[PDB]
Amino acid sequence: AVQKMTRVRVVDNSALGSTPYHRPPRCIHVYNKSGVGKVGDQILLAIRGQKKKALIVGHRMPGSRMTPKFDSNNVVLIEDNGNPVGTRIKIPIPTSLRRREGEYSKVLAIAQNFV
Amino acid sequence: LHSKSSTWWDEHLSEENLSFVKQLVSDENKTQLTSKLNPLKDEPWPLHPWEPGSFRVGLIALKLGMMPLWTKDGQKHAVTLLQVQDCHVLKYTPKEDHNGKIAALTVGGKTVSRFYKPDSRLEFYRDLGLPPKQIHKIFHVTDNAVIKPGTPLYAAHFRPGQYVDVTAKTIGKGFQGVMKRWGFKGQPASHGQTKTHRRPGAISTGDIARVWPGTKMPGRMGNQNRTVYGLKVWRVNTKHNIIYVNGSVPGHKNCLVKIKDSTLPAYKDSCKNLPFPTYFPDGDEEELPEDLFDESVWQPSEPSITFA
Amino acid sequence: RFLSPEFIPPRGRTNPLKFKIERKDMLDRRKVLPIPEFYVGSILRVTTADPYASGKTSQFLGICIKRSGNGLGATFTLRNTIEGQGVEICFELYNPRIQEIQVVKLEKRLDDNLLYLRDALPEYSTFDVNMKPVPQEACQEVPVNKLKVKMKPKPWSKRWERPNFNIKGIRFDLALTEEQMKEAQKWNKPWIEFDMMREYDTSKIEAALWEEIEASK
Amino acid sequence: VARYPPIVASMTADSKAARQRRVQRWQATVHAAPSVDEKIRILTKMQFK
């Protein structure tokens, strides 16, 4: 579960996240009628003075049986037009993203490992 | 003293007669219940065919518990187990006496002891020739669907794929506050709040100088009759008379419930396929399989699901 | 004689019939798919058919950190670390999309819960995906691995030092000073282990259940 | 081969038997004192009428 003011780990190779900076990114908005964010839910980060959209690809909170619980809250940065900012994702991504209602094929293409 | 005194069944019985009476009372339960096992050969009332707009009887069952269940699509459905237990038709009224447009049938389940019951209830059952039942309930039945009193009912009265409605008394929560009874937010923990955390706020406005009737206040929570609508029947166990009903049912385990066809608009006349008066095992037209399933259900002992 | 835990009923006011009905269904699935004997701490490989694809299969290998549940809903959790990312999947034994369960390495650990492996160093959580199975001896007792793991800095998921967890697999000496160990012992309830009305004896229940399971065979 | 516990009174109870058992506890700290100054100090440190 991601909320407002949560601390997030960018799991791309994009410069926006990749570059080591003393502050992690923090969530400013969750794009849902429910304030909570789960796998496949977009969020608006505040990353290095910039406001950037992102997608949740994993979280530490338990989900339904047969789905993977991660140890960190993982997020990918997406451009305003919706194209991913980064070109590669080396961390495993759950396969549930494929069937959730939304646009996730672009992210899946960039992800080599699926869990 | 020449005054009122209290007695109970065991007060005057000796050690030997204590066991004898127990065996005798249980003996009577056996003979009485086997007399009614054959309704169709005991002057059954005429069996009318189904016509649109008919409402048939329902059953009283005991709540065994819950278990998981799966469909051929791989989805998991939590299901509740309801056991039809000593369910008999008890009384019939006609449309006129019930004062409704429709007639009424009173059913009863879960035979109980006879030792701490009022004389009135015992006489009611002695006339009907049945051991006493734990609970009575009333079902609205059309004239074509009337069934003679003393007729047993069984879980096979329902079939997988039909939707049903269950009504039972909810779990009691005792006297409760306003947060747990109606989900009121309450007041902050710190920052100066003095002796007000879970309290109701302002009851009402200053103008009306009273409290409106129906204002939500602390009180006794639970133990109320509630009904769940549109629960699917996934499977029926004919040997043990078990019904698998989708989702949750009001009440605690071992609580008696009322099961009848669903009254929701969609399933208005779905009882065409089901046994219209009731399911008679004495008729023995065809012997049912021990387990009845719904087509989507994935039965155990089947090959593992491979969504090829 | 290893009786799988899910068969043991929990105490309560539920009828025995509800359990008998479930056992028959549980035995039916076991005939179609064989569920191997395993304990918490043993490494398992589970092959499951993915419902998001066309019956294609997926494989996940990890150490069984937790076992819980009764009846046909029993579950077991198992963890691994993939490209330096820990993941835990809570599998359901009787889910009809578990193609196969293979006990890569059968063993027992000092504790019946290994949730603390979340706070241990990553080495104790990482297991090779491609590892081949190790041999087993049927007419023998399962080995008990007495490894004591080393923890990372103190802020942990839970207070594992506290006496209610009763963890015996962590090197508390390295990570905690004796002052902390003494302080943590202020939450100790010595009477719990010595009150006889809190113990659930399942010996007779296990004996009867074991006979039924063999009889069905 | 049963290790029955020794049949002695409790140390902390509020009884005469339990007090006489707390008396041997300090009396044993004199027996085990190496120097005679410690023995006399222990035997005389507590002032009573």
Added chain:
Amino acid sequence: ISHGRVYRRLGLGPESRIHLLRNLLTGLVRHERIEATWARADEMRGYAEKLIDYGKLGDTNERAMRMADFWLTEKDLIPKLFKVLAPRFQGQNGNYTRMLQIPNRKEQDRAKMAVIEYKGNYLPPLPLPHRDSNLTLLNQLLLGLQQDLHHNQ
């Protein structure tokens, strides 16, 4: 909501509850007949039953010894449990304790009281409630019915 909970709240807390019951159990083992409040005697009856089970396990059992050591504060009772009480109850499968209600305490608190004892003790027999004889009018009629029913198949 206290649905399903099988313990009374006694004493100053959970630990205090055990110690209060522990003293009652120690008295029961020594004396074999004790008077206490009905609620407390009812709470201690369960431990009285299970303690005898541990004694049955045997002297050499280490788990029995540790449990017996905890519950019997007077250690002279440990031989009594293993060598007196347990041999007495070898035949029985349960129901070692007999608990009955006695008049209310005449001490201005009017507590509800009970006498709890182990079966088979040496003390004078308690005045138990004795059922009626078969010679009574009601019993004979029931006895008459029994003879006919058995004899005629």
Added chain:
Amino acid sequence: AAPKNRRTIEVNRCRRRNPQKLIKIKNNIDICPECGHLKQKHVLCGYCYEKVRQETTKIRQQIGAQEGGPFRAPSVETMVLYTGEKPSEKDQGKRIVERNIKRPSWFT
């Protein structure tokens, strides 16, 4: 909050003489067959029980005198004998408590 008006005896008389506040009559009182004293049906007789406990205290007094000190509980069964009775073969190797009085009629 303080009363705005004094409450009348007619209002008070309805409150404190309501049936909910009255003492309920008991139907469970009966006689003890042996002593002829009153008892409730589900509780023991307080007169017959008084006989037993007074005898029990006497026996427990004698046990203490025999032991002579704390922590002297025997590891063998106990038995009580009255004047004019001698241990039987089954009574061998059991602590014997001796009472001056004759065997009570109820005690067997």
Added chain:
RNA sequence: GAGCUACCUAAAAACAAUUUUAUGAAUCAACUCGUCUAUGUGGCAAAAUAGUGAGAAGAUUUUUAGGUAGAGGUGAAAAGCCU
């Protein structure tokens, strides 16, 4: 009316352990004080309790007996204190 309290006179007391040094220095008890919050509000108490805090070899704290008295006394001034 100074057995409370303000100030004073005379005769007496108390301050462990640790580090600095050679001290209105440091950490922190006993002791003195009363910062912040909660409880309490005819209360245990006509100003307390429970926590949390400030000082703690000094302009320190405490004990005993004496002194100053209302147009006055005392005051590291709060128009404080003087039962």
